[PDB]
Amino acid sequence: YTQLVCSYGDFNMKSGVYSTSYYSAKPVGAYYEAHVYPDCNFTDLFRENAPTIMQYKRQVFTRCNYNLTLLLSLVQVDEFVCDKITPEALATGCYSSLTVDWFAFPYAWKSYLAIGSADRIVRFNYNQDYSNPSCRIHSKVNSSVGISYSGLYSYITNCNYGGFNKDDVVKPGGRASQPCVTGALNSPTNGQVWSFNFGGVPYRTSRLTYTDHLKNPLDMVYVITVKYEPGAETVCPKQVRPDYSTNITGLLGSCISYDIYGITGTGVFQLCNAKFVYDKFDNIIGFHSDDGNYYCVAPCVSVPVSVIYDDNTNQYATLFGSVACQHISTMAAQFSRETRASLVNLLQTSVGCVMGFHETNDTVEDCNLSLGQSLCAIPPNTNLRVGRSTFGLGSLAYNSPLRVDALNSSEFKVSLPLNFTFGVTQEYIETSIQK
Amino acid sequence: PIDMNKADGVIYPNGRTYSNITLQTTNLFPRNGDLGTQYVYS
Amino acid sequence: SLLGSIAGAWTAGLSSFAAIPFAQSIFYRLNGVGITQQVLSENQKIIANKFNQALGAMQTGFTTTNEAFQKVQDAVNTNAQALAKLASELSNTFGAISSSIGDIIQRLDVLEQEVQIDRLINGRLTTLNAFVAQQLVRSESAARSAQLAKDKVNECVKSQSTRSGFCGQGTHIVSFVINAPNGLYFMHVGYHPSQHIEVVAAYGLCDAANPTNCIAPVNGYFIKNQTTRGVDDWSYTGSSFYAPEPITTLNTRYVAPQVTFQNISTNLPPPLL
Amino acid sequence: ITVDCKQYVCNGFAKCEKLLEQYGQFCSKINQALHGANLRQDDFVRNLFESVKTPQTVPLTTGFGGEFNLTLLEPLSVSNARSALEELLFDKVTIADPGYMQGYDDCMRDLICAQYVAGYKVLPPLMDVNMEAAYTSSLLGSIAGAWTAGLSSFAAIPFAQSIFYRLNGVGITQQVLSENQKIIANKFNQALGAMQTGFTTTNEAFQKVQDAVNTNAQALAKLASELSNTFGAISSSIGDIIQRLDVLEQEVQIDRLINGRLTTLNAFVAQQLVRSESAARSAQLAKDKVNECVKSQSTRSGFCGQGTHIVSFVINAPNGLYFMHVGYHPSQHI
Amino acid sequence: SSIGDIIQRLDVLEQEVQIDRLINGRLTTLNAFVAQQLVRSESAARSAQL
Numbered sequence A: 001y002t003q004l005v006c007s008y009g010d011f012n013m014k015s016g017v018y019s020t021s022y023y024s025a026k027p028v029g030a031y032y033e034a035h036v037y038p039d040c041n042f043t044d045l046f047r048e049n050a051p052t053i054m055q056y057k058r059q060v061f062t063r064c065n066y067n068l069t070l071l072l073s074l075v076q077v078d079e080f081v082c083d084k085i086t087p088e089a090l091a092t093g094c095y096s097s098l099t100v101d102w103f104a105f106p107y108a109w110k111s112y113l114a115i116g117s118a119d120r121i122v123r124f125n126y127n128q129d130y131s132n133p134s135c136r137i138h139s140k141v142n143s144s145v146g147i148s149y150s151g152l153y154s155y156i157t158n159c160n161y162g163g164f165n166k167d168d169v170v171k172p173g174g175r176a177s178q179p180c181v182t183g184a185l186n187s188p189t190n191g192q193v194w195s196f197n198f199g200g201v202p203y204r205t206s207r208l209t210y211t212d213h214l215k216n217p218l219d220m221v222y223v224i225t226v227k228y229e230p231g232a233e234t235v236c237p238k239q240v241r242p243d244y245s246t247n248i249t250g251l252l253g254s255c256i257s258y259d260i261y262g263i264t265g266t267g268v269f270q271l272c273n274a275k276f277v278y279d280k281f282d283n284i285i286g287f288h289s290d291d292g293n294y295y296c297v298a299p300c301v302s303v304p305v306s307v308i309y310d311d312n313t314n315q316y317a318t319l320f321g322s323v324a325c326q327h328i329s330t331m332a333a334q335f336s337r338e339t340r341a342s343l344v345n346l347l348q349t350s351v352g353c354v355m356g357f358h359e360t361n362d363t364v365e366d367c368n369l370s371l372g373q374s375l376c377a378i379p380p381n382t383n384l385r386v387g388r389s390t391f392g393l394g395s396l397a398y399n400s401p402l403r404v405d406a407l408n409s410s411e412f413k414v415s416l417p418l419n420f421t422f423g424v425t426q427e428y429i430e431t432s433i434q435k
Numbered sequence B: 001p002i003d004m005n006k007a008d009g010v011i012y013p014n015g016r017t018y019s020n021i022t023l024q025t026t027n028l029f030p031r032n033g034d035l036g037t038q039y040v041y042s
Numbered sequence C: 001s002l003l004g005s006i007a008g009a010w011t012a013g014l015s016s017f018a019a020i021p022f023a024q025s026i027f028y029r030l031n032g033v034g035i036t037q038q039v040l041s042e043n044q045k046i047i048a049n050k051f052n053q054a055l056g057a058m059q060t061g062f063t064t065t066n067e068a069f070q071k072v073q074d075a076v077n078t079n080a081q082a083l084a085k086l087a088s089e090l091s092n093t094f095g096a097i098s099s100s101i102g103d104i105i106q107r108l109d110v111l112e113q114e115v116q117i118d119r120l121i122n123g124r125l126t127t128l129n130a131f132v133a134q135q136l137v138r139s140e141s142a143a144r145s146a147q148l149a150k151d152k153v154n155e156c157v158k159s160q161s162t163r164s165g166f167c168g169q170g171t172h173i174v175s176f177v178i179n180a181p182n183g184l185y186f187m188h189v190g191y192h193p194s195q196h197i198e199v200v201a202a203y204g205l206c207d208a209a210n211p212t213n214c215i216a217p218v219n220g221y222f223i224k225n226q227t228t229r230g231v232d233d234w235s236y237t238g239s240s241f242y243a244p245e246p247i248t249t250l251n252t253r254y255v256a257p258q259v260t261f262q263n264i265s266t267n268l269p270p271p272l273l
Numbered sequence D: 001i002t003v004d005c006k007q008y009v010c011n012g013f014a015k016c017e018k019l020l021e022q023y024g025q026f027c028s029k030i031n032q033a034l035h036g037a038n039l040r041q042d043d044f045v046r047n048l049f050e051s052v053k054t055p056q057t058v059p060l061t062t063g064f065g066g067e068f069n070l071t072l073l074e075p076l077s078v079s080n081a082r083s084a085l086e087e088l089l090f091d092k093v094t095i096a097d098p099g100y101m102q103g104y105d106d107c108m109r110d111l112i113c114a115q116y117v118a119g120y121k122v123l124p125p126l127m128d129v130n131m132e133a134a135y136t137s138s139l140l141g142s143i144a145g146a147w148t149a150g151l152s153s154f155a156a157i158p159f160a161q162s163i164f165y166r167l168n169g170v171g172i173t174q175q176v177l178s179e180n181q182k183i184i185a186n187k188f189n190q191a192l193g194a195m196q197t198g199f200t201t202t203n204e205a206f207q208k209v210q211d212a213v214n215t216n217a218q219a220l221a222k223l224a225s226e227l228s229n230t231f232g233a234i235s236s237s238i239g240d241i242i243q244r245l246d247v248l249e250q251e252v253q254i255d256r257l258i259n260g261r262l263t264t265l266n267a268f269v270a271q272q273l274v275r276s277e278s279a280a281r282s283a284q285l286a287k288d289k290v291n292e293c294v295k296s297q298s299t300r301s302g303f304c305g306q307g308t309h310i311v312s313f314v315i316n317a318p319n320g321l322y323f324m325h326v327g328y329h330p331s332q333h334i
Numbered sequence E: 001s002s003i004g005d006i007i008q009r010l011d012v013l014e015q016e017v018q019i020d021r022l023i024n025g026r027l028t029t030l031n032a033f034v035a036q037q038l039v040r041s042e043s044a045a046r047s048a049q050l
């Protein structure tokens, strides 16, 4: 009754059969599942010589387990700029792949290396891609971590080519082309344009250094890009969620929270006959776990519960539409508190399972509590104040015609009135609406 | 020539498996009717 | 004015008006549906009493068991709900920090104010569009129902329908109309048999001695073995009330002979003698 | 259709359920709008079958039509409460099984199993198939006897006699009917019995039954499919938003996703209402035809079909009634 | 109102937000158009019958 009242927002509803929402289908317990692989070895990020921006390093991590705390515990974060991801989430999600780009770069120049800019820093050296969720981390790395910064650190300031002086601009996610790197590495550090041929094409390139801006705590840029391709996660965290189980069997037949290969939410799991199984509306309806078992997945709200209510007696009964009554006991945990207790009785009807009804051969003339398929609820004659009582499970009356049989004659029977009454058929026709 | 009615040269999506559906995709595909370059070894 | 035109609305054409008493109109309306004049004359007090019962019953009829009545209240409630939606949806905060423009302006800077106000505007435009679209859907509904009301005024009230179902259940006699909130309330008085008798009827009768001379009943039946109950006992009854009477030329028509017509010798009806 | 709005929109997520309060009592309004629309559909049925309902009938037996073959119209239980044509019509129209009884258990087709995922339910009709069939069966048995002024009496007249009087009443003399009575019965039987092979792609009335079915399916496809949409959000999944973004962007992203799901539900309710008005009009038409084409002989041109109207029959159809009007059509003139 | 103006003025992230705002409005217009044509089709069905 309370679910009915809250679903409609009305304490004084009329009699009828109403669908209702669930107000007690809360999760109890949780299940976590993820792939286990060798660690995503990140040594190359911290224990080598820092890359330049014109020749930055990239490493793509697949089929491994990562530890983001390990990357961050080694560095002093100056700033981070994340897009469609947060450092908090970056640390715990599963990805089809994880990509890290990195190079030495002055913190003072972080505005050059920025989303709306189109400076030479971006045009000829590093052009961040934004098609995938990513985060640009500006951090200071201490020499105690093994980071070094020998040699010249430089960026390309120009790289036009051909007779039209066409700027060989770097495309998002790309890098300076081999002709530009070849040129710039042979260019003077005073920013002067050097001309050379690369194969059959003339190039004019120039560079500037930033070596003088690099100090003992080394200003580094690490850009972490994560790809999400549901069903193809190969990269997962080493850390398992603190309150989640890693064995689902003790959680079957119950509404739980879950995190399965990056897919989260609540639902009810059942062991079924045979990594994610989808319907035609992109819903996950089952999965193959790593212990070999296949499970079905349903929302914690899967049974189309409706309430039959009589506002004269304030009596009510429940229909679990289209559900066989055997399955109702097992789903008791997701129903209202008083339904759950009552299930811990039921009649099977052609429209579903009904609770709070008794069988009756009585029929109904005006059926204001139709259940469907010629079934009608027949209200109790006792008010709720006395106590709860059941509804008759009856049917819509078929008031058959008089049967006048024909004669195998040249004559026929006719039924004529002997008496008669007058009756008034009342009808309302709405002819206009409020203006 | 590439025959689109046989899905010649079509690269399957790299995520989930799709079944008994039609999917609208913009991606790297061959052109229908395209004659590629033939190479011969002996 | 419509009530005052019912009794007089008689002949072909809509040009004339007859200032006929209501009671006379009812008796002709009953005769026109198969109740003979002898019956109407004998039962005229009974007819008036039953009619009065049926009609006067409406004084206590506007209750929760009266579907036509509840339908009036529902039309009223429907209009109220449409307005509830304009009045209530103003309080919504459509992704904004507040439903109040004033609260947005005094809390956020000039750039976020534009975003937040636009969110709030979009929701209020949506509400108005939804309102107009339903009024239009409800206008089409009214156009259809207004058309129906016109047909019933012209066919049930200003005349006597012979159409089944239309103008109510049973045999239609007379309709009345009063105004209702947002429309019209129709009250159709019909004739409803309460008890029946089954008798045997002929398709027609022929003179056995003169087989080309055959008759058929008009607005009734030729029924057998009801009066005197001897040889070749045939009599006429109105089709809407069992009341056997002698077969006369006022109850019959001459017809072509048929294989299903009875051939009678004795107590031959006057139309056949 | 009824919809569990709260489940449809938030899919069990508490943060969404809280944000949803900023749209007012949205779900309460949806629940009441759908409840109202569904009650109207039941009233259309109650009134339609008030017209189908007969005071008196002559019980159907085999050979009901006499010289006229009405076997395809009589109930199988005479020769199932449903006739051979009505079973044939229902078997040639492709309809997904709603699973009204234990349908939940079977899913543990896609627009039906989507009910228990998406958060919506297809409701059963007021009457079952037997009861509706009983009404049309009784209607068939009242045609021959439905003769004189007034609707008070009933004549248990053989079908064949009713046809001959119906033909006489439209200008065919008795000598003609007597000489050609075998010819009339044979032509009638040809025309009517032809329907056994009539439910094909060239039959517009039939294809119209399938289209009504397809229309209902499309409405549900829109509830089931639009949940997968990502309405400017990073994901269609609330869970993906919560686990990827911080607490402030989550509210913006969830609101984007909610707004789209509220829009879908509003669009659904508005069409059901437009389609309810359509049904109100068509239900009215069906009542007029039952009372004017079947229970009587129309003299109105066009109404009750082409040519001169003689007799109509009615069987049930998915979402409505199927009328078969037998008319008299001259084939050669002088 | 111009997609081209959005692309040439904003960066790649705000372009998606701004284009989505513009798309949502254009989808709304098309949905409103279809819904009225359907309401007007029902009107015509009734009048054609008349």
Ligand SMILES: *[C@@H]1O[C@H](CO)[C@@H](O[C@@H]2O[C@H](CO)[C@@H](O)[C@H](O)[C@H]2NC(C)=O)[C@H](O)[C@H]1NC(C)=O
Binding pocket: A067, A069, A070, A071, A073, A238, A239, A240
């Ligand atoms: C992820 O990496 C962190 C290091 O950043 C690990 O935490 C360290 O654990 C060792 C013991 O093995 C302690 O001595 C260190 O003091 C810890 N360091 C910090 C910063 O906490 C953490 O255990 C790793 N996670 C997993 C699942 O292996």
Ligand SMILES: *[C@@H]1O[C@H](CO)[C@@H](O)[C@H](O)[C@H]1NC(C)=O
Binding pocket: A041, A042, A043, A044
């Ligand atoms: C990690 O990579 C470094 C090279 O950068 C290599 O020397 C080291 O042995 C690797 N460690 C593991 C456990 O693979």
Ligand SMILES: *[C@@H]1O[C@H](CO)[C@@H](O)[C@H](O)[C@H]1NC(C)=O
Binding pocket: A142, A143, A144, A145
């Ligand atoms: C930085 O590295 C130096 C040299 O190894 C070490 O002495 C110092 O403790 C480190 N400081 C920090 C903050 O890690």
Ligand SMILES: *[C@@H]1O[C@H](CO)[C@@H](O)[C@H](O)[C@H]1NC(C)=O
Binding pocket: A247, A248, A249, A250, A291
């Ligand atoms: C899960 O726990 C059950 C005991 O409750 C045990 O029998 C089963 O083997 C465990 N499964 C795994 C994968 O550990």
Ligand SMILES: *[C@@H]1O[C@H](CO)[C@@H](O)[C@H](O)[C@H]1NC(C)=O
Binding pocket: A359, A360, A361
């Ligand atoms: C209804 O009638 C049937 C007839 O067989 C009987 O078996 C059944 O017990 C009756 N039920 C009730 C509730 O009267």
Ligand SMILES: *[C@@H]1O[C@H](CO)[C@@H](O)[C@H](O)[C@H]1NC(C)=O
Binding pocket: A418, A419, A420, C194
């Ligand atoms: C007709 O029915 C009424 C009500 O039962 C009764 O009072 C009256 O005497 C009856 N008359 C006949 C003709 O049976």
Ligand SMILES: *[C@@H]1O[C@H](CO)[C@@H](O)[C@H](O)[C@H]1NC(C)=O
Binding pocket: C225, C229
């Ligand atoms: C006429 O009615 C009487 C009285 O009921 C009955 O005994 C007699 O057999 C009937 N005769 C015929 C031909 O029906």
Ligand SMILES: *[C@@H]1O[C@H](CO)[C@@H](O)[C@H](O)[C@H]1NC(C)=O
Binding pocket: A410, C206, C211, C258, C259, C260, C261, C262, C263
């Ligand atoms: C009455 O006589 C006519 C003419 O002989 C015949 O055609 C018809 O079948 C007879 N009908 C009956 C009821 O005997």
Ligand SMILES: *[C@@H]1O[C@H](CO)[C@@H](O)[C@H](O)[C@H]1NC(C)=O
Binding pocket: D069, D071, D072, D084, D193, D196
């Ligand atoms: C009557 O029609 C049925 C088909 O519905 C056919 O099987 C039967 O043979 C026909 N009978 C006659 C006498 O034509």
